[PDB]
Symmetry: C2
Subunit: 50 residues, 2 copies
C-alpha cells in the first residue's frame, strides 16, 4: 500500500524521483538550529549551533 | 558656627562624644554593598561585594 507508507514521511520532506545510490551505507537525517542556554546564580551562558 | 557645619554631615552618620585618636593619619569613609553586572551577546556575569 503506497498510500499508508507515504503518510509516514515528514511534512518538510519534499522527495524527487531519482536517487543515485553508489554505496552500502546511507546516513539519512535532518539539519536543525539548536539555541542552548545555561542559567546559574553567577549568570547566563548562551550558545547556538546553526 | 556649629549649626551650618553640622548640616554638612551625612544622614546615616550618628556621631558619639569621645574619639580616641592615637596616630597622625585617619581613613574616614563608609562600607557599601555594590551589585555589579556585565551583560554581553554570549551571556550575563553577575558579581556582589558585600
Amino acid at each position: 500500500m503506497s498510500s499508508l507508507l507515504n503518510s509516514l514521511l515528514p511534512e518538510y520532506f519534499k522527495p524527487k524521483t531519482n536517487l543515485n545510490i553508489n554505496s552500502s551505507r546511507v546516513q539519512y537525517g535532518f539539519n536543525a538550529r539548536i539555541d542552548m542556554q545555561y542559567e546559574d546564580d553567577s549568570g547566563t551562558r548562551k550558545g547556538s549551533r546553526p
